[PDB]
Amino acid sequence: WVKVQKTRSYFKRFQVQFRRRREGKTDYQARKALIIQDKNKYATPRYRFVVRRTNKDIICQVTAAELTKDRVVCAAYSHELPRYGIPVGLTNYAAAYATGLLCGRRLLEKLSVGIKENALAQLYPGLDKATGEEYHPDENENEEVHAFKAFLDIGLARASTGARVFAAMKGAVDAGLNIPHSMKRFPGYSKDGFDSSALRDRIMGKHVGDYMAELKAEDEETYRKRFSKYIAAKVEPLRLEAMYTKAHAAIRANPQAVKAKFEIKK
Amino acid sequence: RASAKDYVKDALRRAKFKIPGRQAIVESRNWGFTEFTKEEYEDLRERGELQYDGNNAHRISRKGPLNL
């Protein structure tokens, strides 16, 4: 009665897309334009700085593409921060920035394990005070040991203005990595001037504290529903700046990773 | 059928004189315009796996969905 669209011939003709394209986890146009490199360079490693978000976690990876696979050099997961002193609110702007800082410190300390006089952690020690201003490790221009260079890969997320992937890139930059970038798509840009306080606001997470204050002011019942874990951990909406400050102190002091043994069940 | 079995070759002989060159009249071993022989078609119809259709006979299929 009705013609059948999926036939013998339809299936015989059908070409399947690459597995990771069918699963919707890769864009190969962007992947080509990221891993491309001039052919008179003869297998010199190129590096992506990959930022990925899930529900309940943030991942930052430094990666190089080989023939049959690709090496992750350093990794840093935002669920380690509870160890450094950030118990709740993970997956917000502050945690994205802090995880970027963690990955940067860990990479540079790792590649400066052993070197005595000129080591990429003593050279290029990052930025300390968490000021949220423009900064570029490539302006320093040491002429014998350059800064570590990577390019920001963000996959399928949107490059909106005020995005957590850019926050994490900023934290890596403050840790001391060369990551070429503009300040467009950061909070505090009017196209005729960029400011630093309106960026430190989101870095230190004042929006969350202001929202807790006003929500607790009008509706306490919904305060309890919205923020139950914040209440349970008793971190008041006013101590966040100190908590982030100390978190940064610990991250810079001990960026080394500790391998959590575990036992996985089928 | 068996009614015209004697006169088909007469009609084909009439036909042969209208075509250029040399042509051969033959009687096949198959059953009608079907693709089995008469004796194989016999046994096949006798055991029952032979599928019928409008004017042609096929075999049991044995492949695909079981019944539904």
Binding site: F14, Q15, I35, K39, N40, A65 | -
Partner: protein, 153 residues
């Protein structure tokens, strides 16, 4: 003929293979090339920049120039009584690394390997084209006897 545009006579050689349309896989750009290497030319019909003429499809040559985006390849081409050494500039989608000396490198390595491994006598290492076969024994305790059959028609 009466017409010889650049892509005359390309209806089949430049068409893409069945269920092999779309973007190239990325080994096309992760392969590493060197000066002096051997390559085959095969035109991929989806990539239009730096696409060699039809004469060069199915030939083997040597790299003379490594460039930022294209490779330089030397091809010997016969013209009307002599051979000419032609030089072309081809982008990566149209070249593959060639295996024309794979067998030779295998044999050289094996020759040195067996010389080191020597068993005290050194084996003959020259390739030997198939010889006539030696004398041997076959049992015939179970022969099958066949004959021409009769014409069946």
């Amino acid at each position: 003929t009466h017409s010889q545009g650049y892509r005359c006579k390309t209806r089949y050689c430049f068409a893409r293979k069945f269920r092999r349309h779309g973007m190239a896989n990325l080994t096309t750009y992760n392969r590493v090339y060197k000066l002096g290497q051997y390559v085959n030319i095969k035109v991929n019909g989806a990539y239009h920049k730096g696409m060699p003429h039809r004469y060069y499809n199915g030939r083997t040559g040597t790299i003379f120039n490594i460039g930022p985006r294209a490779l330089g390849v030397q091809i010997q081409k016969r013209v009307r009584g002599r051979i000419m050494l032609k030089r072309i500039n081809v982008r990566l989608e149209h070249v593959h690394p060639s295996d024309c000396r794979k067998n030779h490198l295998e044999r050289v390595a094996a020759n040195d390997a067996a010389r080191r491994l020597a068993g005290q006598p050194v084996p003959c290492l020259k390739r030997q084209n198939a010889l006539p076969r030696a004398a041997h024994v076959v049992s015939i305790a179970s022969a099958i006897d066949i004959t021409p059959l009769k014409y069946d028609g």
